[PDB]
Amino acid sequence: IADYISEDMAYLMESACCHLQSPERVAEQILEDLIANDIDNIMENIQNKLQDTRNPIRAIGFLLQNMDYETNADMEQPQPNTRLNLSTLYGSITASSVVCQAICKISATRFLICRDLLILQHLLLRLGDMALIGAGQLLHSQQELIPRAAQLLLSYYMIRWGSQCLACAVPVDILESNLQHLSVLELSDSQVEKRRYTSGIQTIVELFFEDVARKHFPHVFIQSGASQLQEPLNWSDLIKRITNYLLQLLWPSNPNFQFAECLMRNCQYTQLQEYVRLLLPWCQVNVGSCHFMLAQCYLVAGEGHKALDCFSQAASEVEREDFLEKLIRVEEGESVSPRLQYYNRVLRLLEDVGLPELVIQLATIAIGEASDDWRSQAALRTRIFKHHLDMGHNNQAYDALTQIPDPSRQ
Amino acid sequence: LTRQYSHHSTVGDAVSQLDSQLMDITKMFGQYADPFRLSECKLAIIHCAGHSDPILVQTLWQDIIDKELSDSMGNSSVDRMQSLHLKITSLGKIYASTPRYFPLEFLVKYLEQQVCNFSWDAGFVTYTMQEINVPVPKLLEVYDHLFKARDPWWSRMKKPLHLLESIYILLSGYVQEPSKVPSYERRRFTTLCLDAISCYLVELQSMDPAPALLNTVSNFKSLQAKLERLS
Amino acid sequence: MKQDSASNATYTVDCEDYVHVVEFNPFDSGEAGSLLAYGGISYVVIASCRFQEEDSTVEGIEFKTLKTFHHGERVVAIAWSPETRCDALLPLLRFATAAGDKKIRIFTSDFQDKNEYKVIEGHSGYINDLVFCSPEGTDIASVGDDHTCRIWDLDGKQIAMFILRSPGMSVAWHPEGAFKLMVAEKTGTIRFYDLTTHQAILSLESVQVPLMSADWCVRNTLRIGAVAGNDWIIWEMPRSSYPQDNKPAHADRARMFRWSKCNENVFATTGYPGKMKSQIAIHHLAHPQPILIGTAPVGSGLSWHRRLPLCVVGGYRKLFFWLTEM
Numbered sequence A: 001i002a003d004y005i006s007e008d009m010a011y012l013m014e015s016a017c018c019h020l021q022s023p024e025r026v027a028e029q030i031l032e033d034l035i036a037n038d039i040d041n042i043m044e045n046i047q048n049k050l051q052d053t054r055n056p057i058r059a060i061g062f063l064l065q066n067m068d069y070e071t072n073a074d075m076e077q078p079q080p081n082t083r084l085n086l087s088t089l090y091g092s093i094t095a096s097s098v099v100c101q102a103i104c105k106i107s108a109t110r111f112l113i114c115r116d117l118l119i120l121q122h123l124l125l126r127l128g129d130m131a132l133i134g135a136g137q138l139l140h141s142q143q144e145l146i147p148r149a150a151q152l153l154l155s156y157y158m159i160r161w162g163s164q165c166l167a168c169a170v171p172v173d174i175l176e177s178n179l180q181h182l183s184v185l186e187l188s189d190s191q192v193e194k195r196r197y198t199s200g201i202q203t204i205v206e207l208f209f210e211d212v213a214r215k216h217f218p219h220v221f222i223q224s225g226a227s228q229l230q231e232p233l234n235w236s237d238l239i240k241r242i243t244n245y246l247l248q249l250l251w252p253s254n255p256n257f258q259f260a261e262c263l264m265r266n267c268q269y270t271q272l273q274e275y276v277r278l279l280l281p282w283c284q285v286n287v288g289s290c291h292f293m294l295a296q297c298y299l300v301a302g303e304g305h306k307a308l309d310c311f312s313q314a315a316s317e318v319e320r321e322d323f324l325e326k327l328i329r330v331e332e333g334e335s336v337s338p339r340l341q342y343y344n345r346v347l348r349l350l351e352d353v354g355l356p357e358l359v360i361q362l363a364t365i366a367i368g369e370a371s372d373d374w375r376s377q378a379a380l381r382t383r384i385f386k387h388h389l390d391m392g393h394n395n396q397a398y399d400a401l402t403q404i405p406d407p408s409r410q
Numbered sequence B: 001l002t003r004q005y006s007h008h009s010t011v012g013d014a015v016s017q018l019d020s021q022l023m024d025i026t027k028m029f030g031q032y033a034d035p036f037r038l039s040e041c042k043l044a045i046i047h048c049a050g051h052s053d054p055i056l057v058q059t060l061w062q063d064i065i066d067k068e069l070s071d072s073m074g075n076s077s078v079d080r081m082q083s084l085h086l087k088i089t090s091l092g093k094i095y096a097s098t099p100r101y102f103p104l105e106f107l108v109k110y111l112e113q114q115v116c117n118f119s120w121d122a123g124f125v126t127y128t129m130q131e132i133n134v135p136v137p138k139l140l141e142v143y144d145h146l147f148k149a150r151d152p153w154w155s156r157m158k159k160p161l162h163l164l165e166s167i168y169i170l171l172s173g174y175v176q177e178p179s180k181v182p183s184y185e186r187r188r189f190t191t192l193c194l195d196a197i198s199c200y201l202v203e204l205q206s207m208d209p210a211p212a213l214l215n216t217v218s219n220f221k222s223l224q225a226k227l228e229r230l231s
Numbered sequence C: 001m002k003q004d005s006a007s008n009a010t011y012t013v014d015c016e017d018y019v020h021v022v023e024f025n026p027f028d029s030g031e032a033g034s035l036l037a038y039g040g041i042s043y044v045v046i047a048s049c050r051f052q053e054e055d056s057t058v059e060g061i062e063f064k065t066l067k068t069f070h071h072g073e074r075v076v077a078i079a080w081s082p083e084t085r086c087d088a089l090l091p092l093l094r095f096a097t098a099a100g101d102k103k104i105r106i107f108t109s110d111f112q113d114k115n116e117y118k119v120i121e122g123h124s125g126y127i128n129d130l131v132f133c134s135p136e137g138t139d140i141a142s143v144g145d146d147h148t149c150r151i152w153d154l155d156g157k158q159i160a161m162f163i164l165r166s167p168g169m170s171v172a173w174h175p176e177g178a179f180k181l182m183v184a185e186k187t188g189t190i191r192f193y194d195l196t197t198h199q200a201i202l203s204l205e206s207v208q209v210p211l212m213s214a215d216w217c218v219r220n221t222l223r224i225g226a227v228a229g230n231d232w233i234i235w236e237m238p239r240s241s242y243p244q245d246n247k248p249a250h251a252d253r254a255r256m257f258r259w260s261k262c263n264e265n266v267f268a269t270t271g272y273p274g275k276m277k278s279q280i281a282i283h284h285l286a287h288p289q290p291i292l293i294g295t296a297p298v299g300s301g302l303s304w305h306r307r308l309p310l311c312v313v314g315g316y317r318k319l320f321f322w323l324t325e326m
Helices: A007-018 A023-036 A042-051 A056-066 A093-130 A135-164 A172-184 A204-223 A235-250 A258-265 A269-279 A287-300 A304-317 A322-326 A338-353 A356-369 A374-391 A394-402 B011-020 B025-033 B039-048 B054-071 B077-095 B104-118 B124-131 B136-148 B152-156 B162-176 B186-205 B211-227
Strands: C011-014 C021-024 C034-039 C043-051 C061-070 C075-080 C093-099 C104-109 C115-120 C127-132 C139-144 C148-153 C158-163 C168-174 C177-185 C189-194 C199-205 C211-216 C223-228 C231-236 C245-248 C254-259 C266-271 C278-284 C292-296 C299-304 C310-315 C318-323
Touching: A007 A023, A007 A135, A023 A042, A023 A093, A023 A135, A042 A093, A056 A093, A056 A135, A093 A135, A093 A204, A093 A235, A135 A204, A135 A235, A135 A269, A172 A258, A172 A338, A172 B152, A204 A235, A204 A258, A235 A258, A258 A269, A258 A287, A269 A287, A287 A304, A287 A322, A287 A338, A304 A338, A304 A356, A338 A356, A338 A374, A338 B152, A356 A374, A374 A394, A374 B186, B025 B039, B039 B054, B039 B077, B054 B077, B054 B104, B077 B104, B077 B124, B104 B124, B104 B136, B104 B162, B124 B136, B124 B162, B136 B162, B136 B186, B162 B186, B162 B211, B186 B211, C011 C061, C021 C075, C021 C310, C034 C075, C034 C299, C043 C093, C061 C104, C061 C115, C075 C127, C093 C127, C104 C139, C139 C168, C139 C177, C148 C168, C148 C177, C168 C211, C177 C211, C189 C211, C223 C254, C231 C254, C254 C299, C266 C299, C278 C299, C278 C310, C278 C318, C292 C310, C292 C318
Parallel strands: C021 C299, C127 C168, C211 C254
Antiparallel strands: C011 C318, C021 C034, C034 C043, C043 C061, C075 C093, C093 C104, C104 C115, C127 C139, C139 C148, C148 C158, C168 C177, C177 C189, C189 C199, C211 C223, C223 C231, C231 C245, C254 C266, C266 C278, C278 C292, C299 C310, C310 C318
16 A cells, blocks of 8 residues: 555645644545555455455554553552652763654554555455455454544644654743743642753753653653663663654553643643644543643633633533642642632733733633632632722722622622 | 952953043943943942933843842842842942832832742832831832732732732831821821721722731731721 | 713823724734834834733823835735744734735734735735634635635635625634634625635624624624624624624724724724714623713724733724723
């Protein structure tokens, strides 16, 4: 199949992934064009070779399984005491780029394999009951395997795109101010080690590797049975382990959401918007966290109304996603709904940016969720009153004042 | 140069040139103050030249503060606070009469951020500015502006009440010593404080009830009742 | 008797020629001053503006002409490229103009000797508005009296064309979305297009006609503002195709609408140029009345400063600036 795919057909699949078209329908179109142009009886050669396969479903399932980096959420948190000698392993810019180039190449080769596999699966569907001993099991198993191959294609397209996407040059003062704003959100436990950004061009994957993934490698080394500090360093095993681990962290379905968090922390808003644009239509794991990150990107872009819509969408998934749950866990105060705690956090952020109209809209929504807590309702209505008064909306400030349930605050 | 750069090979030649003739301000800035990052001397140069760039003045004050905080990194938290206080008081007494070279709102904001970063006494900035002879009414106007600006920095630092704690210390100092304000403006100033405290109490009631917030509300009610005895 | 206390302009700058359009650079040029362009009868002037509100070293307004381009025709609209940078080792000035000859001109300059312009032809009617794609800076959208919205590369090749049902009056790219385009039609219809699918996503209808100007709120991508007939109109998407707010803007028709670049609740409108004075009204959504009312002689253009709550209007041989409180 790969040897007969024209440059135009290869571009058509890559363009389909970029434009969020169904890769299954596009694989079917490429298959129609391949059958229409079958001058060399290649479909007969593929059929003859498929007849030599005893169980094509098991072979497809094996390829998809070796290409799947979906992680079950048991990445145990690091014990502190072994950090000091291994923190510098693979810490050079040369090693960072070699590892990130390994990902670029693996994701590129596996993207081609997933494309050609999708075309082959549509060929197997068209060949139907006439050629393979298994009529009823093939149709039912292909209904599960085609969407999986499509999801892997999109996942490898995303990793390939990220491995090629250049990071924006951000001034240190803008980064330090963004880290101060994110520290108000408690999204940053990491002290700014005075990283002279070595003023080299990096990809967003090289940036992610240096900032986040690197800190976890000493642990991956210890968990895998290297409890003896005496094993000699083997390049072949170590590069494979590092690359597989970094692929799990870059995986679009990863619940830890660390890749998008790293982009937000490094002020990579344009790349984060494009990453979220490419992810949201088909990945359902971190939807709330994507809308929250997108809302922060729109706030920095000055598009405060779109930011509010995205913050309101993110509020629905706050109890399901570990990243949004981290934003809630620090107020050790009495029984407030997790959505109201989230809205109180977004309200602090909209006040720090100085957008009083959006603070009023969000505080009005947050009063609807505060149905049982008269104290939170009093605080939110006092906030609405203050912002209407500051804006000079005297009638609306007076209306807000009459609705305050606390006579002392009123 | 002799005190801070004695080990630098070029300083012997620089010092001998500075003895050999009186130099123009432009040469002093470009050949000595800039290459050696002498932010105090740069501030003195732009003051003497009558050159007014508010951004440059803020950057020079930042560099002076950051250098004093860096040079004191080996010292105790109290000694670091005292070193910075003596530095800012010494320069503040020179420039506070000329508002173009003493960016009071920037200085108060920046020093309060350092107080939060180092977990120093919230009284530090209010005390330092009063020792410079910054008028209590002008210092309150700056804190009132910084509080009303709702900077997200304070919430990110988990210190949303910090500016109100500094305001409480400032106004408690005025209530203890009403002679810090000239007798002719004292009545007007006490009324402005009562109106400002009433605004701060309304905003504190809109926030989530925390033990620290309830203490701040109690402090402002006690302060209100003391100011009503001074009016 | 309410004497409409028309506020004087906060600042006024004299110009060498008549001002027919004025636009602030909405992008970061990396300079401390805000870049401003204004179009006259046969020239485009590029200037830097610094204000005392952003820089304590400036008393009032520092206005410096950086470059004057000979244009030969009356300029109607100006659009900045997001690639425009002045602080770079190689400064790049790029902007597009629409003119009375129905052509687009893309100017590119290094502020030194390299001054080039490309002429783009294909509109058969007057061009009413034009904009660069913000984030990529590679594409220009334009709309006109030929009932088309057209998309151009920097090479002046037409990439796409949408047939409208009436004259296109304003065009805006989605602030975060490289393929989403708003087009406002004179009959009151505002359409959203996707350039990847070449389809209309959605439409809004104004309660009044003609619609004269529309703007996409940069700070809140759900908000659309427009002027139609005598009123200003606001929509909040996706909640309704019906306007959220509709209120009187001007007695003798509204002409221009622009959102503030720093505040999602603040916008400015201009009245139609009467024989002597155009009214300018700054609005805040929390207030039922304009927060500021200004006047300019024959008001031409309306633009907002990127960071300050400051708007500019051209009038006769002058630029007039109004600062509003936040």
